Design a protein around this ligand. Structure first.
Ligand code: HEM
Ligand code: HEM
Ligand code: NAG
Lengths: 116, 141, 142, 249, 116
């Protein structure tokens, strides 16, 4: 539309992350086994978490589908605890559930906001 | 100002409201009281409990006053002369309350007649209620 | 402040709202009922007639954004003042929207919530809704 | 004369210095205009508040609190009404001490030529009521086009010939209309003055001299967009008494 | 305000009651002792009663402090004897709760309004 004459702010600036696809890792940590726990993301040597903004079972099926586990049932744990803490987050809007990898879901954002 | 189309919209809406006007006015009074307690200062001698017949009658009186105003939309100041003098000098009701009441009344309609409360009808009812409020509060001194 | 009953009622009722329609409808109602507010939204093109504003996608998108802000505020009822501080600075510095227009938005928003809920909008929960819209209006003021 | 800091409903941010706020002893807000270092203009109706009109101006003077600039208090020394107040609501007020003219306190000087020509666009700023009938916290300013006098007389009184006049003011109260007045219609977005903006100047920006001139003092603020015209008193018709009163004091 | 130009009806006319203060006396009647009953008032040898409107333990406390008794406990009594009828009424505003006489309460009205 125009240069500068907008009402955005510096807490909602843009950015980009690019990769060839050989270093995108997704996993679960802090649970009974590999197929349960909190979702842990790894990209280009930095590891962070995700944010509940629509984390329904239908959207959650994709994470299980990528790792070879079955479907998604609930959002909790029973066995193990005390996972590491990182101040970086990933945001996902919506996914229809039949895409085999989380990296293919529409408009997945890596970092830039804190979901308080 | 109330444009002729605006008058037609107001007339149609207040025809559609029907006999439920007294109940809607009582509900609007109760709702204004509950939302903003400060407006109860002008009813010290009033039984303000749930289902009270006093506030029911008061709402019926307000609704009848507004219906009379709609019937005389072209000569509103004369229709509301006595009420204007009552609310201006005798009771000394502050202007703010009037707008408050108007909004309350409006929301009540929206709660009970969603189908007819189109944006144009919303604008028409807002203009009519603003005109009534201005007439009643004009001589405030 | 909000009593636990009011908090429960307001959260439960807000759990039943839809993002993509009610906020846009509220914004369109404000544009149609108070014309002087069009000056700020001139960027959205034609706002001359009611059907135009109701039919404008940009209005619906901005309604989505303001409703998202409202949901965030609901999630931060205790700390509304700090929750909207950035928005307060935004509207105070770049736009010069008077503090009353925020309350105007709150009243039209309450109107459309009544419009959608029908009988379910009992006066006790409307009191809580009035309190929250008043809180956000005051927080955004200055 | 006539140099504001910034030429420009919309919240004022450094554009209207001449404006002044007044409150009576029973908490009603009204407006006024700075005319020189020590004199103001206001409507007479803003002086007979909460008491009978039989009282003297000496009784009026100490009961009114006056703010200028950014909530800067000033004290009133004298109040002098126009001898024919029943038909022209001009009223002048004298400050206790001449103000130090600065960016936030600066007068508006008066017309050497009439500007009340139909279609002329002027500015009106005031502390009056708002859309919710609460006194505005921040100063508000609106743009109004001058309107034909005959249409205003028809709107408020029906007919121009005195014998055939009958009251038809849509807001109940009737304004004072005569040769000492002019009227103005609503803005483009249907913005109009309401309670409490009385006394505010109708400012016209003359580009030839790049100067702001106070063309009128609002004398009817009860329109509140319900009536279609607001009523002002022409400064040119009042210039001479203003000059005489200032010189005599 | 303007002379003659007001809208009060003839049921709202004002009045005044001036006294030395040694001729005002209130008693409790109908109960079992000096300090239980209905609050009867004697102002210039005219009977009366106090209105329930606004009547609370905080005002009853000053009433029973003036008579020489302790703190008020209840807004009722046992009917030991019948009480005669009276026409006048005394309307009491909010009392601060520490003054040593009902007469010291601010803005108390004797007569006029009816206790309907
Ligand atoms: C659309 C706006 C309003 C309308 C049409 C209206 C109309 C009326 C009517 C018809 C009456 C009865 C007069 C009579 O019986 O002689 C009345 C009385 C009264 N109104 Fe309003 N009114 C309005 C706004 C308000 C507001 C905003 C307040 C206060 C916040 C208020 C407070 C009162 C009171 C205290 C009375 C006296 C009731 C009594 O003495 O029993 N009114 N009004
Ligand atoms: C009262 C509650 C309000 C909330 C929660 C709110 C929230 C927001 C938010 C989150 C934005 C950011 C949009 C973006 O970055 O693209 C925004 C922008 C904006 N707001 Fe508000 N706002 C409120 C009141 C108002 C009012 C009352 C007005 C005008 C009458 C207004 C006018 C605007 C405008 C013009 C923009 C910029 C739109 C653009 O140029 O793209 N806001 N608001
Ligand atoms: C007031 O009106 C009278 C009417 O006869 C006129 O003689 C007089 O000059 C007027 N005074 C002023 C100050 O305009």
């Amino acid at each position: 539309h125009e240069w500068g004459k907008h009402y955005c702010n510096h807490n909602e600036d843009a950015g980009v992350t690019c990769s060839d696809g050989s270093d995108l890792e997704l996993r679960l940590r802090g649970g009974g086994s590999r197929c349960a726990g909190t979702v842990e993301v790894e990209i280009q040597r930095l590891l962070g978490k995700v944010c509940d903004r629509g984390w329904g079972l239908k959207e959650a099926d994709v994470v299980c589908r990528q790792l070879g586990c079955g479907s998604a049932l609930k959002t909790s744990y029973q066995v193990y605890s005390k996972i590491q803490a990182t101040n970086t987050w990933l945001f996902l809007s919506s996914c229809n559930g039949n895409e085999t990898s989380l990296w293919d879901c529409k408009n997945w954002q890596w970092g830039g906001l804190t979901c308080d | 100002v109330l444009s002729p189309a605006d008058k037609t919209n107001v007339k149609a809406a207040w025809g559609k409201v029907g006999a439920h006007a007294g109940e809607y006015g009582a509900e609007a009074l109760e709702r204004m009281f509950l939302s903003f307690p400060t407006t109860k200062t002008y009813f010290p001698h009033f039984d303000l409990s749930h289902g009270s017949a006093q506030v029911k009658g008061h709402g019926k009186k307000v609704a009848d006053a507004l219906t009379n105003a709609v019937a005389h939309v072209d000569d509103m100041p004369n229709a509301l002369s006595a009420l204007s003098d009552l609310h201006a000098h005798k009771l000394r009701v502050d202007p703010v309350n009037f707008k408050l009441l108007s909004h309350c009344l409006l929301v009540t309609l929206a709660a009970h007649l969603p189908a007819e409360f189109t944006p144009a009808v919303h604008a028409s009812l807002d203009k009519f209620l603003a005109s009534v409020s201005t007439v009643l509060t004009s001589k405030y001194r | 402040h909000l009593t636990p009953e009011e908090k429960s009622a307001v959260t439960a009722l807000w759990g039943k709202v839809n993002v993509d329609e009610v906020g846009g409808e509220a914004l369109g109602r404000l544009l149609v009922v108070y014309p002087w507010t069009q000056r700020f939204f001139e960027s959205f093109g034609d706002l001359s007639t009611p059907d135009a504003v109701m039919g404008n996608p940009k209005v619906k998108a901005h309604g989505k954004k303001v409703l998202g802000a409202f949901s965030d505020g609901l999630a931060h009822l205790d700390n509304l003042k700090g929750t909207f501080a950035t928005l307060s600075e935004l509207h105070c510095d770049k736009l010069h929207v008077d503090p009353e227009n925020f309350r105007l938005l709150g009243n039209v928003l309450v109107c459309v919530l009544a419009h959608h809920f029908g009988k379910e909008f009992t006066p006790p929960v409307q009191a809580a809704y009035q309190k929250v819209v008043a809180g956000v209006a005051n927080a955004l003021a200055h | 004369c006539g140099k504001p800091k910034n030429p420009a409903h919309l919240d004022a941010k450094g554009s209207f210095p001449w404006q002044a706020k007044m409150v009576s002893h029973h908490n009603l807000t009204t407006g006024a205009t700075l005319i020189n270092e020590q004199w103001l203009l206001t409507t007479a109706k803003n002086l007979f508040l909460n008491h009978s009109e039989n009282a003297t101006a000496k009784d009026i003077a100490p009961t009114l609190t006056l703010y200028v600039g950014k909530k800067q208090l000033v004290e009133i020394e004298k109040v002098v009404l126009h001898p024919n107040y029943s038909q022209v609501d001009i009223g002048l007020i004298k400050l206790k001490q001449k103000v130090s003219v600065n960016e936030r306190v600066m007068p508006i000087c008066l017309p050497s030529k009439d500007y009340a020509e139909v279609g002329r666009v002027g500015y009106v700023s005031g502390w009056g009521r708002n859309a919710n009938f609460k006194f505005t916290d921040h100063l508000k300013y609106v743009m109004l086009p001058v309107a034909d006098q005959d249409q205003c007389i028809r709107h408020y009184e029906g007919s121009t010939v005195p014998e055939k006049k009958t009251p038809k003011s849509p807001v109940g109260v009737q304004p004072i209309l005569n040769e000492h007045t002019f009227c103005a219609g609503m803005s483009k977005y249907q913005e109009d003055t309401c309670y409490g903006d009385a006394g505010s100047a109708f400012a016209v920006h003359d580009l030839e001299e790049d100067t702001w001139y106070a063309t009128g003092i609002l004398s009817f603020d009860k329109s509140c967009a319900v009536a279609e015209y607001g009523v002002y008193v022409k400064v040119t018709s009042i210039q001479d008494w203003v000059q005489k009163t200032i010189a005599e004091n």
